[PDB]
Amino acid sequence: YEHTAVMPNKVGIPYKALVERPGYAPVHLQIQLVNTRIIPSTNLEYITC
Amino acid sequence: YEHTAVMPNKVGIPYKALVERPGYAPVHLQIQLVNTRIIPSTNLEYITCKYKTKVPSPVVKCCGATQCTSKPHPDYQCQVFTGVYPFMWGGAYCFCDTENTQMSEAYVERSEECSIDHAKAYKVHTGTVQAMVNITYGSVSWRSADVYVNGETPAKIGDAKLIIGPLSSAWSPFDNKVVVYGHEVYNYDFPEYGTGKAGSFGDLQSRTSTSNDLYANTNLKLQRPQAGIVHTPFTQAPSGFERWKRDKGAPLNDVAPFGCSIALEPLRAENCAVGSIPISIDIPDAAFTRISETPTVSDLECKITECTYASDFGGIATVAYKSSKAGNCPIHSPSGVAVIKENDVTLAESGSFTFHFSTANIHPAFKLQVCTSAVTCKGDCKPPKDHIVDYPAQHTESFTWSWLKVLVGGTSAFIVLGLIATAVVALVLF
Amino acid sequence: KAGSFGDLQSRTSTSNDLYANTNLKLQRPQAGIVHTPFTQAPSGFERWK
Amino acid sequence: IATLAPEPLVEHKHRTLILHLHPDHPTLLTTRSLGSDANPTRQWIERPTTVNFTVTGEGLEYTWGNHPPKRVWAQESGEGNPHGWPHEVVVYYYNRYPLTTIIGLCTCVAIIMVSCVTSVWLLCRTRNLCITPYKLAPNAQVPILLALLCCIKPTRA
Ligand SMILES: *[C@@H]1O[C@H](CO)[C@@H](O[C@@H]2O[C@H](CO)[C@@H](O[C@@H]3O[C@H](CO)[C@@H](O)[C@H](O)[C@H]3NC(C)=O)[C@H](O)[C@H]2NC(C)=O)[C@H](O)[C@H]1NC(C)=O
Ligand SMILES: *[C@@H]1O[C@H](CO)[C@@H](O)[C@H](O)[C@H]1NC(C)=O
């Protein structure tokens, strides 16, 4: 039942998928990507002023 | 109503057949062959174990010879020796220098471990297999009885009389010759009592533990003690019981076929799932319910709702029960396609009650006999995801058409088109 | 994965939080004696050396 | 008071146990494919090793040292035969039967080649015929060429 799901990157809205496990009752999702903060790899090269 | 039934040999799962006695209400079975312990016919041929060169203390004649004799001890190795000067606590003690004689003697004897830590050979014949068959029968709901396989033995434990086998699957996982060790059982071609080459398995060969006589081919060869000192060089192969514990083969409870477990207990080979068993029972007629007391269920409907194409009872199906009275109703699929968890379903006046089951064909077209009312629970099933736990309840795999029916009918249509092209040439010909 | 490299995964040395997939499975102590069966993969830092 | 080897890491695959494994000491692992084909295995494992076991339909058992013997249902996991495509989803039926489908398909490929060449002869011979009665008279006024339409071109009659 490991519910793989392609999923649009968009922040402020849930994505209520559905678990179709064969055998037991299905269960809904509610996946809201509340944030997409990134934090790339960087380097402080020089301050200027 | 003596319900004969061929029945697969497989241990840990019931076999809920259905008694179709003409005249009274049918009754379900629940036959779970909880065990398949075997206990072949055998013979203790010889214990073996590692020797102990329990040297008798050598003679030392000081001036002249001491002829040895071949005492009857097992592998009584004895060799006279001269040319010593035996340092014993005061330097030497025998005042001669070549007439100093030393007679070394050593025989083989069972270790103290031979009583307890010992391999054990056997000539193994077939014997007769057993089982603690539970039947939580009908409304009886219980009997857990030990039975046999030979096809005329009853066992009237509970209320039902039941005759089992003989099974068709005569594979004794034991070979003819077997060695046994504590719990690890080895289907080994042990050489024999009386013969075993030294170093090889069975260098010591005692009939039993008590048996003072034995066969000890250990290649025990005494050598002369060194430089005029008292001791006993015994040059000997460490036992073929020493090896056979660290250069051995693997155990039959780890290399057998067709699914067996083992014990150093009556020498059974438990739970050997293979083949079928022609089982037949004589139910107590008192346990029957007459037909005019169970609800008639016809004018019903059955359908799957979430069929799981699987082992665990994932298949389900509602049934639009259309009863006459209200009560219980034993159920079974006479087709082996579907195996059902529920033996019995309770019924109000024409309600609906889902049951659980398991199948192996994508389109399970299995009949369901709800207490004398058949129905096809046709449908379609879904594969699962999560397959690493013990053994199934399905055990019904067979041949399981989307490109075969009109395909091969189409394949035929090419060659069917032939003899309607040919012999129409005969018409154009005339 | 436990046993594999990075069974323990701490952000840094100070970081009290971490990820420890070690497959640590406690078993019951034997025959009425005080002790703690911890059944565990020696680390993927033990191997990797 | 005696030995025990650290628990295994069970990993699923299609009728196959990957087992990343990591003992304390050399551990004799062994199994018994419970078919009447036993096909057992033995190997002392001291070095951590990801191993594999072709589990069958009916079951296998697994003995991580003197840790008790495990057991495993490996029925399918290759998804049977649902259907909404033409044939690339039939791999599901192949992935469950990669012994009988290779021959069962080649059988299905064979019989169509049988049904091909038999259809070749019992068309082309019968196309060679029904023109030999017709295209030898060569006027041959019969507009029921419309039964072969592989040997063609009447004479406007
Ligand atoms: C008879 O066939 C049965 C097939 O399932 C099995 O019998 C099982 O025996 C168990 C022990 O007697 C029962 O467990 C107990 O059930 C009660 C009622 O549910 C619980 O209160 C108990 O806690 C529970 N015991 C434990 C230790 O959990 C099973 O209920 C019972 N099976 C059924 C269906 O009732 C056996 O396979 C077989 N009996 C044998 C071989 O003795
Ligand atoms: C499966 O295990 C075997 C070891 O017998 C190995 O050779 C093979 O690469 C493994 N396959 C995997 C991990 O996909």
Author numbering:
A (entry chain A): 1 to 49
B (entry chain G): 1 to 400, 408 to 437
C (entry chain D): 197 to 245
D (entry chain H): 264 to 420
Question: What did the paper state?
Answer:
To gain insight into the molecular organization of encephalitic alphaviruses, we determined a cryo-EM structure of an EEEV virion derived from a SINV-EEEV chimeric virus to a resolution varying from 3.5 to 6.5 Å, corresponding to an average resolution of 4.4 Å. The EEEV cryo-EM map shows overall conservation of structural features among alphaviruses. The E1 and E2 ectodomain are resolved to a resolution of ∼3.5–4.0 and ∼4.0–5.5 Å, respectively, with the relatively poor resolution of the latter due to potential flexibility. The capsid molecules near icosahedral 5-fold axes have a resolution of ∼3.5 Å. EEEV neurovirulence, HS binding phenotype, and avoidance of lymphotropism are linked to three basic residues, Lys71, Lys74, and Lys77 (“Lys-triad”), on the E2 ectodomain (Gardner et al., 2011, Gardner et al., 2013). Here, these three E2 Lys residues are part of an exposed β-strand and loop on the surface of domain A. N-linked glycans are attached to EEEV E1 Asn134 and E2 Asn315, which are each part of the glycosylation motifs Asn134-Ile135-Thr136 and Asn315-Phe316-Thr317, respectively. The EEEV cryo-EM map accommodates an N-acetyl-glucosamine monosaccharide at the E2 site and a disaccharide at the E1 site. The icosahedral capsid shell in EEEV consists of an outer layer formed by the chymotrypsin-like CTD and an inner layer formed by the extended NTD. The E1-E2 dimer interface has a concentration of complementary acidic residues on E1 and basic residues on E2 ectodomains.
Here, we report a 4.4-Å cryoelectron microscopy (cryo-EM) structure of eastern equine encephalitis virus (EEEV), an alphavirus that causes fatal encephalitis in humans. The icosahedral shell of alphaviruses consists of an outer layer of trans-membrane envelope E1 and E2 proteins and an inner capsid layer separated by a host-derived membrane. Alphaviruses utilize the E2 protein for attachment to incompletely characterized receptors (Schwartz and Albert, 2010, Zhang et al., 2018). Endosome acidification triggers conformational changes in the E1 and E2 proteins that generate the fusogenic conformation of the E1 protein (Gibbons et al., 2004, Haag et al., 2002).
